[PDB]
Amino acid sequence: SLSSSALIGLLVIAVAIATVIVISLVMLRKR
Prior knowledge:
Layout (H helix, E strand, L loop, with lengths): L6 H23 L2
């Protein structure tokens, strides 16, 4: 019942987007 180690590749993306949030504001400065 949903037991694939591949889930690691999906989790890394979640956090990969978080770091983009803090940078999102920096974009408004160069926009």
